[PDB]
Write an enzyme that holds these catalytic residues in place. Structure first.
Site, mmCIF file in Angstrom:
data_model
loop_
_atom_site.group_PDB
_atom_site.id
_atom_site.type_symbol
_atom_site.label_atom_id
_atom_site.label_comp_id
_atom_site.label_asym_id
_atom_site.label_seq_id
_atom_site.Cartn_x
_atom_site.Cartn_y
_atom_site.Cartn_z
ATOM 1 N N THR A 1 0.842 -1.195 0.000
ATOM 2 C CA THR A 1 0.000 0.000 0.000
ATOM 3 C C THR A 1 0.875 1.241 0.000
ATOM 4 O O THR A 1 0.378 2.360 -0.057
ATOM 5 C CB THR A 1 -0.914 0.073 1.246
ATOM 6 O OG1 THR A 1 -0.104 0.205 2.429
ATOM 7 C CG2 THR A 1 -1.792 -1.179 1.341
ATOM 8 N N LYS B 1 20.996 -1.430 4.392
ATOM 9 C CA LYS B 1 20.613 -2.139 3.166
ATOM 10 C C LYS B 1 21.655 -3.202 2.834
ATOM 11 O O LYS B 1 21.311 -4.307 2.404
ATOM 12 C CB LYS B 1 20.492 -1.165 1.980
ATOM 13 C CG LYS B 1 19.369 -0.145 2.076
ATOM 14 C CD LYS B 1 19.613 0.996 1.089
ATOM 15 C CE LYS B 1 18.624 0.993 -0.070
ATOM 16 N NZ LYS B 1 17.294 1.593 0.281
ATOM 17 N N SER C 1 -4.908 2.111 7.232
ATOM 18 C CA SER C 1 -5.612 3.354 6.949
ATOM 19 C C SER C 1 -5.736 3.448 5.437
ATOM 20 O O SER C 1 -6.327 4.387 4.901
ATOM 21 C CB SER C 1 -4.827 4.555 7.475
ATOM 22 O OG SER C 1 -3.593 4.695 6.796
ATOM 23 N N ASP D 1 15.008 -1.711 -1.808
ATOM 24 C CA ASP D 1 16.090 -0.818 -2.212
ATOM 25 C C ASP D 1 15.417 0.294 -2.996
ATOM 26 O O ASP D 1 15.026 1.315 -2.435
ATOM 27 C CB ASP D 1 17.106 -1.535 -3.109
ATOM 28 C CG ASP D 1 17.844 -2.650 -2.389
ATOM 29 O OD1 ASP D 1 18.098 -2.512 -1.175
ATOM 30 O OD2 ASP D 1 18.190 -3.662 -3.037
ATOM 31 N N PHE D 2 15.282 0.078 -4.299
ATOM 32 C CA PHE D 2 14.631 1.038 -5.186
ATOM 33 C C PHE D 2 15.168 2.471 -5.061
ATOM 34 O O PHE D 2 14.395 3.424 -4.987
ATOM 35 C CB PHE D 2 13.106 1.001 -4.941
ATOM 36 C CG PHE D 2 12.527 -0.393 -4.981
ATOM 37 C CD1 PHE D 2 12.060 -1.006 -3.820
ATOM 38 C CD2 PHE D 2 12.544 -1.134 -6.164
ATOM 39 C CE1 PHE D 2 11.624 -2.350 -3.828
ATOM 40 C CE2 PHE D 2 12.117 -2.464 -6.191
ATOM 41 C CZ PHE D 2 11.657 -3.078 -5.015
HETATM 42 N N1 LIG Z 1 14.360 6.396 -5.283
HETATM 43 C C1 LIG Z 1 13.518 7.326 -4.777
HETATM 44 O O1 LIG Z 1 13.384 8.454 -5.283
HETATM 45 C C2 LIG Z 1 12.700 6.941 -3.552
HETATM 46 C C3 LIG Z 1 11.719 7.849 -3.016
HETATM 47 C C4 LIG Z 1 10.935 7.463 -1.898
HETATM 48 C C5 LIG Z 1 11.112 6.192 -1.325
HETATM 49 N N2 LIG Z 1 12.107 5.335 -1.841
HETATM 50 C C6 LIG Z 1 12.303 3.932 -1.354
HETATM 51 O O2 LIG Z 1 11.204 3.061 -1.691
HETATM 52 C C7 LIG Z 1 11.061 2.134 -0.576
HETATM 53 C C8 LIG Z 1 9.661 2.269 -0.046
HETATM 54 O O3 LIG Z 1 9.370 3.673 0.155
HETATM 55 P P1 LIG Z 1 7.878 4.198 0.301
HETATM 56 O O4 LIG Z 1 7.858 5.673 0.531
HETATM 57 O O5 LIG Z 1 7.119 3.671 -0.881
HETATM 58 O O6 LIG Z 1 7.264 3.442 1.561
HETATM 59 P P2 LIG Z 1 5.919 3.981 2.313
HETATM 60 O O7 LIG Z 1 4.863 4.301 1.330
HETATM 61 O O8 LIG Z 1 6.368 4.995 3.296
HETATM 62 O O9 LIG Z 1 5.581 2.701 3.208
HETATM 63 C C9 LIG Z 1 5.363 1.429 2.584
HETATM 64 C C10 LIG Z 1 4.435 0.667 3.487
HETATM 65 O O10 LIG Z 1 4.957 0.223 4.841
HETATM 66 C C11 LIG Z 1 3.908 -0.237 5.687
HETATM 67 N N3 LIG Z 1 4.260 0.168 7.050
HETATM 68 C C12 LIG Z 1 4.312 1.479 7.523
HETATM 69 N N4 LIG Z 1 4.655 1.566 8.787
HETATM 70 C C13 LIG Z 1 4.837 0.277 9.165
HETATM 71 C C14 LIG Z 1 5.210 -0.291 10.407
HETATM 72 N N5 LIG Z 1 5.454 0.482 11.476
HETATM 73 N N6 LIG Z 1 5.312 -1.663 10.472
HETATM 74 C C15 LIG Z 1 5.059 -2.433 9.368
HETATM 75 N N7 LIG Z 1 4.695 -1.987 8.135
HETATM 76 C C16 LIG Z 1 4.600 -0.614 8.107
HETATM 77 C C17 LIG Z 1 2.653 0.456 5.169
HETATM 78 O O11 LIG Z 1 1.705 -0.492 4.668
HETATM 79 P P3 LIG Z 1 0.357 -0.998 5.428
HETATM 80 O O12 LIG Z 1 -0.390 0.208 5.959
HETATM 81 O O13 LIG Z 1 -0.306 -1.758 4.300
HETATM 82 O O14 LIG Z 1 0.807 -1.923 6.545
HETATM 83 C C18 LIG Z 1 3.193 1.367 4.041
HETATM 84 O O15 LIG Z 1 2.250 1.612 3.013
HETATM 85 C C19 LIG Z 1 12.149 2.430 0.483
HETATM 86 O O16 LIG Z 1 13.221 1.516 0.412
HETATM 87 C C20 LIG Z 1 12.488 3.859 0.139
HETATM 88 O O17 LIG Z 1 13.803 4.167 0.584
HETATM 89 C C21 LIG Z 1 12.880 5.706 -2.931
#
Ligand SMILES: NC(=O)c1ccc[n+]([C@@H]2O[C@H](COP(=O)([O-])OP(=O)(O)OC[C@H]3O[C@@H](n4cnc5c(N)ncnc54)[C@H](OP(=O)(O)O)[C@@H]3O)[C@@H](O)[C@H]2O)c1
Length: 310
Positions: free
Chosen positions: A12, A128, A39, A107-108
């Site tokens: 999500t 990582k 949520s 990672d991403f």
């Molecule tokens: N390359 C870039 O420009 C870039 C930019 C932003 C992020 N990233 C990377 O992409 C990856 C994911 O980032 P993101 O922003 O997509 O993630 P995100 O939307 O912040 O979170 C991903 C999911 O984690 C779950 N979660 C949140 N808090 C949690 C907790 N306390 N315990 C267990 N699960 C929890 C939630 O799902 P539920 O509510 O379904 O449980 C949430 O939707 C990371 O490795 C980040 O470093 C890269």
């Protein structure tokens, strides 16, 4: 039928929702593990209408994870930085289950095993790498995805298209090159390679030639697109450096990413290694949305701004 069953953690999430959609669009049986105190109820309903199987639970439910791992073939983790070492809970289940064909940790971003940033970002990279070492140590089949910059994310961040300001902030000289890719493509491609033998136990980098640019160039092109010239205001590197040292945590972390991205250009400061795989070259029927196309999208129907959790 033959389709590998895909399990997505963080589905999500900001980038996670795109992996879930690309997986379904690719006809892959898709499991989405999500917290009960969810949520993202409306988004989950959408996944459900798309054919996804929702699995509510906590990462602490080791037995649930094990029994779940047994029903799938591929595991993808799109969890946030705060939950990075929690991936060891996902890893332990995979180990016990033993049937996982491919594991993609979260990672991403930039290529962690070939670039060094300021202490703040250096710390997250170190984590990582911890995960990576654990994966290889156990000989778990994997794929390390360096997707570079999330495009919609950074266009909103750098251009603030939802703000008719006359000035625009440039970090450092703005001469640094970086690659940025559309979130929808990052999702689709991640699913493609997660089943691509050509990416097995490899580092895949998303760097299509049509998506490499500098802040200034990006600004200049946005200007032509909308027909409006902006006043550029630079933030000296030395100031960005001092802030990472002064500002608290997690505030200082994105400051270190900014320096690494737009000042150091860690997404273009390296050449491809022999074993590296650049994804745009993998599929002749697929292509990454280009920058120009991205700017077009932000003109005809711009996506809402977003901030990563630290
Ligand atoms: N390359 C870039 O420009 C870039 C930019 C932003 C992020 N990233 C990377 O992409 C990856 C994911 O980032 P993101 O922003 O997509 O993630 P995100 O939307 O912040 O979170 C991903 C999911 O984690 C779950 N979660 C949140 N808090 C949690 C907790 N306390 N315990 C267990 N699960 C929890 C939630 O799902 P539920 O509510 O379904 O449980 C949430 O939707 C990371 O490795 C980040 O470093 C890269």
């Amino acid at each position: 039928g033959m389709k590998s069953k895909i399990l997505i953690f963080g589905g999500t999430g900001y980038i996670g929702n795109h992996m879930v959609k690309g997986s379904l669009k690719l006809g892959h049986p898709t499991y989405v593990f999500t917290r009960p105190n969810s949520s993202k109820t409306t988004l989950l309903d959408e996944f459900q209408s798309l054919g996804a199987i929702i699995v509510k639970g906590e990462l602490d439910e080791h037995e649930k994870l094990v029994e779940l791992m047994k029903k799938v073939d591929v595991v993808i983790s799109a969890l946030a930085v705060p939950q990075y070492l929690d991936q060891f809970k996902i890893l332990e289940a995979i180990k016990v289950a033993g049937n996982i064909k491919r594991f993609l940790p979260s990672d991403f971003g930039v290529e962690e095993d070939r670039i060094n940033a300021l202490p703040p970002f250096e710390a997250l990279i170190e984590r990582k790498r911890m995960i990576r070492r654990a994966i290889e140590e156990a000989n778990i089949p994997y794929t390390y995805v360096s997707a570079n910059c999330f495009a919609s994310y950074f266009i909103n961040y750098l251009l603030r298209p939802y703000d008719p300001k006359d000035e625009i902030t440039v970090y450092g000289t703005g001469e640094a090159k970086f690659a940025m890719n559309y979130e929808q493509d990052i999702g689709l491609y991640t699913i493609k390679v997660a089943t691509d033998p050509r990416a097995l136990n490899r580092v895949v980098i998303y760097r299509p030639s049509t998506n490499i640019i500098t802040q200034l160039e990006l600004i200049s092109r946005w200007e032509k697109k909308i027909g409006k010239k902006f006043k550029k205001i630079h933030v000296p590197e030395e100031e960005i450096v001092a802030l990472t040292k002064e500002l608290p945590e997690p505030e200082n972390i994105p400051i270190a990413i900014l320096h690494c991205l737009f000042i150091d250009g860690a997404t273009m400061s390296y050449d491809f290694k022999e074993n590296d795989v650049e994804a745009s070259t993998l599929y002749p029927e697929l292509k990454f949305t280009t920058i120009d196309e991205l700017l077009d999208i932000f003109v005809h129907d711009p996506p809402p701004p977003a901030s990563a959790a630290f």
